[PDB]
Design a protein around this ligand. Structure first.
Ligand code: ANP
Ligand code: ANP
Ligand code: MG
Ligand code: MG
Ligand code: MG
Lengths: 593, 593, 102
């Protein structure tokens, strides 16, 4: 009778005793700002923090999930170029500019960066407010929000001191957010910094293996042999990411694959990318400038329409463009209008040859003092002595006509982008790791590790052929199976119908609407063929080649999107002691007066 | 001209670069709740935190300063006794009580503790709001407020499980404060816990040496010899603290002072009290129950008025009370009324023999099963078989008369309190360290380290004699110089005048008003004489004996008050890694749902 | 009794050496150090962190560390360093640079 009565009070103390002894889980928000070539966008993540008595607070790596990738705001290159347009004078690209004199315009650069940072801050708060509940908002606001803004190919080739000075200003803007929203955003020079091409690739590798459950320190994903060495239970997969201005080729070295002295591989533990508790791997990570969608599109048109084999009487014959397609002779943004016509935007900012022509200037110290970089520009038809407009201009050319020959398109993508005579401009990082071009990657370094392809158009190249039944539903990544399917697709005629321009497939296979995204997809199809040709040429061949947008989580729903974002989080969060000191001990409270 | 213009922008970046690289100082509040015998009070402290990149956040020990000691609320003993009065029935002290049955009244104990905790919380917030400015309030609220509630002699002798169960409830009440005030109070079982008598003494030693700038790890306060051992530049000082229910005797062992096997000394580094970077010391720390002001006052009246040498026909002659002074025969609170009369409060709660009579009960397992503890009670005139009222009652006594003989008062304080035949009840901790009584301390362990005396009445004993010109302004602590001065003062007559009772000093020396604080000061004067007699009897004698209330800081203004408060803070804050994990990594955020 | 840590670092001699050869030699060199003559009593030992080919930047950086250490410009003690009011350690004397022509 009273035995059960005294047990309630006994349980009351046990419950209270458990609360103090047990660990407590709280929700924390993490922000990664992708300051890429094309745009500057926020990526809001959510992770589960665990605080234990005498053990401090840590993040569960498996709990890291993307809630939303924000709006695409102005790129860091545009911000700095606008500042130079107003504080170093208009058309500074064709004139010699004194960098020392620009130091008096640093407070003016702060205002330009403030405008962009206020947009990114407003967008981040809008995402958090829409996805988090009141209980979730309290935990998120109390812990603070670590912000990691990393620049990529956009400002990677940026001349002088300007880029680094902007980063000092960007960090102050993050560390000083609006107190009205309640979200405590904070940063440091270790989180917010320009990331290298190898780092961009390495983080993308960490993201892929984490999400696909290949990389882990637990017994479910790893195994300790009789000599105390931790090995992963499943083979670590490599990645191929194609952005706006650069492409990354990342793969781990399986077994005792001996490499030349010139070729530099990165051991994840030795180079402090992953903790010692994680299984070790020697990874080849290389990034190629002028290989991303936007930059490669501009460079291809410049080199192809400069060759006497393709340019005749002002008419440049493009094998990567469909039969009947017609456009003006310039690297500017192409808009496929409803009447079948191609509207080419002649604005300098919207021109796809601009970042390359701005780098290839005799007024840039990387050209005037380094003859090697000048010859790299001249071989890609850009004269650094000539003014900006003359550099982006395809000389003696009026109209680009589409021939639709896939084999000729592959042959040209190969000689221009994949395997050129001299390396593509602004690729000193790639050359220092021992790779002057894409063909040299698989020639000097090869792996039996499965590869994953990432990039909007890279996926679109495969999906379009799969949709028209040219490629099998199950596609392992056969080189000649792809080349046969794309050859039949690229030879297709363009018929301007009442509905608009339609891609008419030969032998009455099928049809699809022509737009600003698929008009030049044959260049990317040829790029995929050439890339897979070198992978199949290498001493070691991947087990399988997969094309993925995002990795599906354990519940079926995808946890996060593929890229360097999750990788940069894990690079900091996995170092338990170091993360606790910067994110929790110092925190947003460090910013206080 | 433009050289100075570009330098402004150069300085703009340098200032911003310094902000991210440098350390940032923020203000943090620290709370120590003294849950003593007499009362439960808050102590609000302020410290300067320093967060450095890759170094985390730490507290500057020298920046720790007391802002205010709060109001004196109900003691933990009263809270638990009131709970037993209502849930185990009234007069539970004289009846056998089943502890198992009290487990059904745990939620009821929570309400009793909630009432006290809400008062302490309200008082703490009132102190913070009155002393901190708006800028200071923000830094204090953002970092969180570590709370350290430690129980002393009040519940040290508390029977059964009740005390420990209360502490589990107390921590939940701290961890759940009012969100309205904004102050983020939090605790853990390492901060909020009952502290031992040795710990109470050891922390009081750490406070004294920290404030007086004797204890430090820097070259200003310490020195490294040719064998890599850190020694303090100045001699570490010992302390004698006299509270309400217990007295602590603490002193470090200088040189290779060899001690007996039974005598247990505590090495500050080995017992994890101070970090390894601090200079090491072997410290003798002992606490004696029934030696504090309130408890010793009750015990003395019980033992003196039970001796046939002092009790005749219901009139107890007290040598520690002035000539002409008259009071009722009971240990209850004495109020000196304006008409010269002594009002003795006969309420059980207000009676000074209550904690001793409650411990000395045949129904308490420490008496019924342990014969040694029963004989300790019987020798101090308390019969554990008799009811509570009969235990506190001074049998065959009606009125206490003051004889004013100082030499007879010293002789009685010695045989009763200082050197009794059997140890004073509830002193198992003292006996386990090798000290059954006060006389045994200096007999077995002695040091040439300077001693510091602490306690309201202990200081008052010296100051009163200094004021009447009986003792020199400069007083080193001479035993017979004190005994001569006090002998002339204690022999003083009490004259009931129109203004009230006045202490008339012999040979027309001077006069002072008699009140509830100085009527029995001669017992404390005799206690100081007896204490200094044993210090002078020991093999090693202190360099100097000083009487201090608080230690003056470097600016002249005192940083904090003497006691175990600053010592308990330094015991946690000085362990850089451990403090950062519990106070900053886990923090108040640990309490979140 | 304590053992003798061995650090074999190659400079410009094999820096430009073609193919695998150099790196394969370093795996063999470490095994030869880790297996010395027991007759002499000197306990020589190495690891891939100590014995390895050093880069040109590393060769220069170590030469900078040597110069500043020996000339008493580099140090963590109060005699050679100073902590400002913002908790940052600065060296009391200016750190000197080096030009080494091998
Ligand atoms: N909203 C979009 N989402 C995904 N891809 C897009 C989007 N808009 C354009 N693209 C295409 O994808 C490319 C940019 O891909 P993206 O992942 O943003 O890399 P990036 O950050 O701009 N380049 P990098 O500096 O090398 O990291 C463009 O050149 C387009 O072909
Ligand atoms: N407001 C007060 N401030 C200082 N001393 C006081 C005060 N009120 C009473 N006292 C005297 O000081 C004694 C209590 O001193 P105190 O420092 O509070 O120790 P305590 O915490 O009650 N005892 P303990 O449990 O052994 O730590 C009383 O017995 C009085 O003689
Ligand atoms: Mg990118
Ligand atoms: Mg006390
Ligand atoms: Mg040399």
């Amino acid at each position: 009778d009273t035995e059960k009565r005294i047990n309630v009070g006994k349980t009351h103390l046990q419950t209270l005793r458990n609360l103090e002894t047990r660990c407590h889980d709280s929700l924390q928000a993490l922000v990664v700002i992708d300051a890429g070539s094309s745009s500057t966008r926020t990526n809001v993540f959510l992770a589960k923090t665990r605080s234990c008595p005498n053990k401090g607070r840590s993040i569960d790596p498996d709990s890291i999930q993307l809630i939303r990738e924000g709006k695409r705001f102005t790129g860091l290159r545009v911000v700095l170029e606008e500042w130079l347009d107003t504080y170093a004078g208009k058309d500074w690209e064709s004139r010699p500019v004194d960098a020392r004199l620009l130091f008096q315009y640093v407070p003016q650069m702060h205002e330009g960066a403030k405008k962009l940072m206020q947009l990114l801050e407003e967008d981040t708060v809008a995402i958090l407010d829409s996805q988090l509940n009141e209980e979730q908002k309290v935990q998120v606001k109390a812990l603070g929000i670590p912000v990691m803004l990393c620049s990529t190919a956009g400002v990677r080739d940026f001349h002088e001191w300007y880029r680094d000075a902007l980063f000092v200003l960007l960090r102050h803007l993050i560390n000083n957010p609006s107190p009205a929203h309640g979200y405590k955003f904070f940063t440091n020079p270790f989180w917010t910094r320009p990331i290298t091409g190898a780092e961009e690739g390495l983080f993308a590798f960490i993201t892929l293996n984490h999400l696909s459950r290949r990389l882990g320190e637990d017994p479910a994903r790893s195994m300790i042999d009789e000599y105390g060495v931790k090995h992963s239970r499943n083979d670590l997969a490599g990645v191929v990411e194609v952005g706006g201005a650069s492409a990354q080729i990342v793969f781990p070295l399986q077994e005792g694959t001996v490499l030349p002295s010139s070729v530099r591989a990165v051991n994840l533990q030795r180079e402090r990318l992953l903790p010692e508790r994680y299984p070790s791997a020697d990874v080849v990570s290389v990034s190629f400038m002028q290989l991303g969608m936007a930059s490669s599109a501009g460079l291809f048109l410049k080199e192809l329409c400069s060759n006497d084999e393709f340019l005749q009487g002002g008419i440049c014959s493009n094998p990567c463009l469909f039969k009947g397609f017609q456009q003006s002779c310039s690297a500017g943004e192409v808009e496929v209008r409803p009447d079948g016509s191609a509207s080419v935007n002649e604005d300098v900012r919207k021109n796809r040859l601009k970042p390359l022509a701005t780098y290839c200037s005799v007024h840039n110290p990387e050209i005037s003092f380094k003859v090697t970089n000048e010859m790299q520009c001249r071989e890609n038809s850009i004269d650094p002595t000539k003014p900006l407009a003359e550099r982006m201009k395809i000389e003696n050319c009026s109209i680009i006509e589409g021939t639709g020959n896939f084999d000729k398109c592959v042959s040209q993508v190969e000689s221009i982008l994949v395997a050129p005579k001299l390396p593509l401009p602004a690729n000193i990082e790639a050359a220092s790791s021992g790779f002057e071009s894409v063909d040299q990657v698989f020639r000097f370094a090869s792996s039996t590790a499965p590869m994953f392809i990432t990039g909007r158009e890279m996926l679109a190249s495969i999906d379009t052929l799969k949709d028209h039944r040219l490629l099998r539903s199950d596609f392992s990544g056969d080189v000649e199976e792809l080349a046969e399917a794309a050859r039949e697709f690229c030879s297709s005629e363009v018929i301007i119908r009442t509905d608009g321009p339609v891609i008419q497939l030969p032998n009455a296979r099928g049809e699809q609407k022509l737009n600003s995204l698929n008009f030049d997809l044959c260049k990317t199809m040829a790029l995929t063929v050439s890339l897979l040709r070198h992978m199949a040429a290498g001493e070691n061949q991947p087990s399988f080649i997969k094309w993925e947008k995002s990795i599906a989580g354990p519940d079926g729903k995808p946890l996060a999107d593929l890229g360097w974002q999750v990788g940069v989080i894990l690079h900091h969060v996995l170092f338990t002691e170091e993360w606790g000191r910067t994110a929790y001990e110092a925190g947003y409270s460090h910013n206080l007066e």
